[PDB]
Enzyme design. Structure first.
Site, PDB file in Angstrom:
ATOM      1  N   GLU B 357       0.814  -1.213   0.000  1.00 28.82           N
ATOM      2  CA  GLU B 357       0.000   0.000   0.000  1.00 28.82           C
ATOM      3  C   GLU B 357       0.850   1.267   0.000  1.00 28.82           C
ATOM      4  O   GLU B 357       0.487   2.262  -0.637  1.00 28.82           O
ATOM      5  CB  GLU B 357      -1.000  -0.024   1.156  1.00 28.82           C
ATOM      6  CG  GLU B 357      -1.932  -1.231   1.122  1.00 28.82           C
ATOM      7  CD  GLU B 357      -2.829  -1.248  -0.108  1.00 28.82           C
ATOM      8  OE1 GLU B 357      -3.092  -0.166  -0.676  1.00 28.82           O
ATOM      9  OE2 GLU B 357      -3.268  -2.346  -0.512  1.00 28.82           O
ATOM     10  N   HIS B 487     -16.221  -9.359  -9.199  1.00 37.84           N
ATOM     11  CA  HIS B 487     -15.871  -8.455 -10.292  1.00 37.84           C
ATOM     12  C   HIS B 487     -16.884  -8.491 -11.431  1.00 37.84           C
ATOM     13  O   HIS B 487     -17.044  -7.495 -12.142  1.00 37.84           O
ATOM     14  CB  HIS B 487     -14.464  -8.758 -10.807  1.00 37.84           C
ATOM     15  CG  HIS B 487     -13.391  -8.588  -9.777  1.00 37.84           C
ATOM     16  ND1 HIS B 487     -13.219  -9.466  -8.729  1.00 37.84           N
ATOM     17  CD2 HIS B 487     -12.434  -7.640  -9.636  1.00 37.84           C
ATOM     18  CE1 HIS B 487     -12.202  -9.066  -7.986  1.00 37.84           C
ATOM     19  NE2 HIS B 487     -11.709  -7.960  -8.513  1.00 37.84           N
TER      20      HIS B 487
HETATM   21 ZN   LIG Z   1      -2.853  -2.432  -4.093  1.00 38.87          ZN
END
Ligand SMILES: [Zn+2]
Ligand SMILES: *[C@@H]1O[C@H](CO)[C@@H](O[C@@H]2O[C@H](CO)[C@@H](O[C@@H]3O[C@H](CO)[C@@H](O)[C@H](O)[C@@H]3O)[C@H](O)[C@H]2NC(C)=O)[C@H](O)[C@H]1NC(C)=O
Ligand SMILES: *[C@@H]1O[C@H](CO)[C@@H](O[C@@H]2O[C@H](CO)[C@@H](O[C@@H]3O[C@H](CO)[C@@H](O)[C@H](O)[C@@H]3O)[C@H](O)[C@H]2NC(C)=O)[C@H](O)[C@H]1NC(C)=O
Ligand SMILES: CC(=O)N[C@@H]1[C@@H](O)[C@H](O)[C@@H](CO)O[C@H]1O
Ligand SMILES: *[C@@H]1O[C@H](CO)[C@@H](O)[C@H](O)[C@H]1NC(C)=O
Ligand SMILES: *[C@@H]1O[C@H](CO)[C@@H](O)[C@H](O)[C@H]1NC(C)=O
Ligand SMILES: *[C@@H]1O[C@H](CO)[C@@H](O)[C@H](O)[C@H]1NC(C)=O
Ligand SMILES: *[C@@H]1O[C@H](CO)[C@@H](O)[C@H](O)[C@H]1NC(C)=O
Ligand SMILES: [Cl-]
Ligand SMILES: [Cl-]
Lengths: 188, 596
Positions: B357, B487
């Site tokens: 991240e 998705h």
């Molecule tokens: Zn990511």
């Protein structure tokens, strides 16, 4: 008499960069120890003169310019810059002789709901001359269709407001700038 | 005034006005995910609807500038981004109905729960109920029940909604000068204007299939090795020549074979590299994890984290006094505000996730100087690839020993390395045929090559041939198994996970060359390498200004995705799998089923 440097630096209200104000300094003795031996400023860059030899120096009169810009716009308050602030708000001459001082004012000039008081000029016909000041709110005509007072298509309002918030990055937080110009009464 | 000069001044008005409304909308959704209240869910929608209504107003205003009259390629990209009609090309009622079915699909996917016929008082939704079964259970019937009940209960409800979802999405793409909705998604990789760096929307189909043919040998041997191990786990259930049943793959859909490591571990005797207990004993907190992760990016030449990052990020769970979404996300609110939302625990898995991240933040910090419409990755796959290469270097034993989390006398045998590569292959290479086959099926559905009366018929014909996975029980057209995935029923493109996977190994191989690495590619750690950091930063600063083919060339030296770096990473495992499968059957028959 002592020169009133506290009336400009510790002043409660500071003006916008597009309508920056100027204060003339006449017969008074200066005390640059307060301004130089302090870590309160984030920027302290002098041009044409040194930050120390000024103590044993005299000038005809000193001009103090004060305004507020974002952190990233402080680099434009310097001789030879071409940003939006330097071109449309506050321009310094190439032969500028003075010092530019700025410090972060996130706690007083940025509110949670957004402090939209501080503005700046984004659009203007040609650049400003050194030390020029423009407070006109005339509708900027970017196109060929006339604007006729009402801003529309290709007709934008020339001023846009800074959007200072305390959660912004350091580059987008409000910084109060005081530009001391030296012209050749005031001594050390 | 030149049309180009009128458009530049218009973009100046937009970049300043949009940067303020985007910050209000981003901070509004931050106050919800970190403090789940009803007052914050409306403030998220109010600032969100204001940004959406603002984007539509600037959309039609930007359309009055002819894109052909612009010669500057950079300003030409910004106008094309604003001139997208989006969902407004529909009528007022079709656009209103489209958002109704999109919300109904998203609702029944997240709120749908199935109950056990053996115990009707036991009802479980997907997370954490059914996912815990598909990931841990070894009972054939228990997995078959959870797999079939999820596709027959919540899957059948999505079938009528997904039918109307396809026809409405096609009416949008065909109205925006696209072949179909699948052609609309492929436009993210489209480059048109730069000589020697162009890329057509149809070229993606050609390139994804060309690179997939080179992945077949590595996947076929992994499939044969896993199948042999799965026969020992489920005797009298799997054929040594047939496809793998779908409910035995490790999760609800077989997207990742990670949960099969306990059943397919090559050398279970060797010590596992889990430094979780090490950090617990060295008195580590979430601040140390992110301080150590911050030191990693500084070691390669990247800057520190901003003060606003340390002041505004939510690195720990606030607990029952302040509910919050714990999905690890990297927030780029704009205006110098970078944050990370993560309920960090003192574990090794959160240590590697912190590097992933924060890699997104280093990407966001780099292109912050670009104009507003250009502050994004090169393509949809570039952002995830940058975050993944950080966790690869941070997970190497060389890096863990240098930090102090692994003992200095940890012996790295050739079997411990095969254990690691096998675990990586179950997750990395195991999802490639699944990702390609899924997006291939939706591409055909959007193009109109799969009629409604054989959606599921063609879906499982491709599962058997491409992925090598057979359904345990037959499904007619009443089902909608692809929609049972997040998705598909939540309107997200899926080919990004295929392209990012090839990108991250092209990046790693390219950086380890600049890092002067000499051993195998999987043992490379770009720590302390200022050369590798400068080589990577030259692409992060580009944002979306330069084409992705050019941005990719600035690091790997190639104008297109390449599969060779992916095969070099798993090369020691590929030769080991061929030796293991010398007495096994490599390949599968598309005709065997556990119910013929
Ligand atoms: Zn990511
Ligand atoms: C497309 O248009 C953009 C902007 O109109 C062009 O980039 C611009 O190029 C000028 C010339 O270098 C940059 O101005 C320079 O600013 C620096 C700042 O210190 C100054 O030192 C220089 O004297 C000069 O004034 C301008 O910043 C730059 N714009 C941006 C956003 O960076 C670009 O070249 C055009 N591209 C094509 C293909 O026409
Ligand atoms: C990148 O270079 C740095 C250079 O400092 C490496 O950090 C250093 O790592 C070693 C261990 O590998 C640390 O040694 C330790 O020193 C203490 C004394 O305080 C000693 O008692 C321990 O037994 C241990 O040997 C060293 O302190 C540390 N450097 C600093 C300044 O703390 C880092 O490992 C390199 N990263 C790589 C090669 O990936
Ligand atoms: C600020 C904080 O830490 N928690 C917030 C609180 O400030 C706010 O008033 C409340 C809404 O009622 O949502 C929660
Ligand atoms: C403003 O007030 C502070 C109070 O600590 C003082 O230190 C500083 O010298 C003052 N500035 C001027 C210009 O007098
Ligand atoms: C968006 O729709 C309007 C409706 O007529 C159309 O005029 C315009 O060309 C469309 N925009 C694009 C980029 O096709
Ligand atoms: C990064 O931050 C640390 C403190 O967390 C500081 O000691 C170090 O000098 C900083 N380095 C850079 C390059 O910003
Ligand atoms: C590891 O290496 C030794 C010799 O160095 C060899 O005998 C052994 O077969 C190797 N193990 C594997 C799994 O390749
Ligand atoms: Cl499925
Ligand atoms: Cl085959």
């Amino acid at each position: 008499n002592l020169c009133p440097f506290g009336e400009v630096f510790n002043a409660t209200k500071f003006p916008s960069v597009y309508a920056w104000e100027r204060k003339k300094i006449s017969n008074c003795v200066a005390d640059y120890s307060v301004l130089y031996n302090s870590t309160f400023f984030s920027t302290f860059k002098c041009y044409g003169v040194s930050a120390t030899k000024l103590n044993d120096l005299c000038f005809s009169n000193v001009y103090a310019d004060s305004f507020v810009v974002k952190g990233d716009d402080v680099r434009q308050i310097a001789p030879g810059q071409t940003g939006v602030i330097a071109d449309y708000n506050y321009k310094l001459p190439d032969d500028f002789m003075g010092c530019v001082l700025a410090w972060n004012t996130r706690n007083i000039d940025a509110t949670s709901t957004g402090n939209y008081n501080y503005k700046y000029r984004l659009f203007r016909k040609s650049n400003l001359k050194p030390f020029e000041r423009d407070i006109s709110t005339e509708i900027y005509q970017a196109g060929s269709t006339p604007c006729n007072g009402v801003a529309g298509f290709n007709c934008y309002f020339p001023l846009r407001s800074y959007s200072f918030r305390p959660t912004y990055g350091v580059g987008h937080q409000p910084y109060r700038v005081v530009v001391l110009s030296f012209e050749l009464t005031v001594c050390g | 005034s030149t049309i180009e000069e009128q458009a530049k001044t218009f973009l100046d008005k937009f970049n300043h006005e949009a940067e303020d409304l985007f910050y209000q909308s981003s901070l509004a959704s931050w106050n919800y995910n970190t403090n789940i209240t009803e007052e914050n869910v409306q403030n998220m929608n109010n600032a969100g609807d204001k940004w959406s209504a603002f984007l539509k107003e600037q959309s039609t205003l930007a359309q009055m500038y002819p894109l052909q009259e612009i010669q500057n390629l950079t300003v030409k990209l910004q106008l094309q981004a604003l001139q997208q009609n989006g969902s407004s090309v529909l009528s007022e009622d079709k656009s209103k109905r489209l958002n109704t079915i999109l919300n109904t699909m998203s609702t029944i996917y997240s709120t749908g729960k199935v109950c056990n016929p053996d115990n009707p008082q036991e009802c479980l939704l997907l997370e954490p109920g059914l996912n815990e079964i598909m990931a841990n259970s070894l009972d054939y019937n228990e997995r078959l029940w959870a797999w079939e009940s999820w596709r027959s209960e919540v899957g059948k409800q999505l079938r009528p909604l997904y039918e109307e979802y396809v026809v409405l999405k096609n009416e949008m793409a065909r109205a925006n000068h696209y072949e179909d909705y699948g052609d609309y998604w492929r436009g993210d990789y489209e480059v048109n204007g730069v000589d020697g760096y162009d890329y057509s929307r149809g070229q993606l189909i050609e390139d994804v299939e060309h690179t997939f043919e080179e992945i077949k040998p590595l996947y076929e041997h992994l499939h044969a090795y896993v199948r042999a191990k799965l026969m020992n786990a489920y005797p009298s259930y799997i054929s040594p020549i047939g496809c793998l049943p779908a409910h035995l793959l490790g999760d609800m859909w077989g997207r990742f074979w990670t949960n099969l490591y306990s059943l397919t571990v090559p050398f279970g005797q060797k010590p596992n590299i889990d430094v979780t207990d090490a950090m617990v004993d060295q008195a580590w907190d979430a601040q140390r994890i992110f301080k150590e992760a911050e030191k990693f990016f500084v070691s390669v030449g990247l800057p520190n984290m901003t003060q606003g990052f340390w002041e505004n990020s939510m690195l720990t769970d606030p607990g029952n006094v302040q509910k919050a979404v714990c999905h690890p996300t990297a927030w780029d609110l704009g205006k110098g505000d970078f944050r990370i939302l993560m309920c960090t625990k003192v574990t090794m898995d959160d240590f590697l996730t912190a590097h992933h991240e924060m890699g997104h933040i280093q990407y966001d910090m780099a292109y912050a100087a670009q104009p507003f419409l250009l502050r994004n990755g090169a393509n949809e796959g570039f952002h995830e690839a940058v975050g993944e290469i950080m966790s690869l270097s941070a997970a190497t034993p060389k890096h863990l020993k240098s930090i102090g989390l692994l003992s200095p006398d940890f012996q790295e045998d050739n079997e411990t390395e095969i254990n690691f590569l096998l675990k990586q292959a179950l997750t990395i290479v195991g999802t490639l045929p699944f990702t390609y086959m899924l997006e291939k099926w939706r591409w055909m559905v959007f193009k109109g090559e799969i009629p409604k009366d054989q959606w599921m018929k063609k879906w499982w014909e491709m599962k058997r041939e491409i992925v090598g996975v057979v359904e345990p029980v037959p499904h007619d057209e009443t089902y909608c198994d692809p929609a049972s995935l997040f998705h598909v029923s939540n309107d997200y493109s899926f080919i990004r996970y295929y392209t990012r996977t090839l990108y991250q190994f092209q990046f790693q191989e390219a950086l380890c060359q600049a890092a002067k690495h000499e051993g195998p590619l999987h043992k490379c750690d770009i720590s302390n390498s200022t050369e590798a950091g400068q080589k990577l930063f030259n692409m992060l600063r580009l944002g979306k200004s330069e084409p992705w083919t050019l941005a990719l060339e600035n690091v790997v030296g190639a104008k297109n995705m390449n599969v060779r770096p992916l095969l070099n990473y798993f090369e020691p495992l590929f030769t080991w799998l061929k030796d293991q499968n010398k007495n096994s059957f490599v390949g599968w028959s598309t005709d065997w089923s556990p119910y013929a």
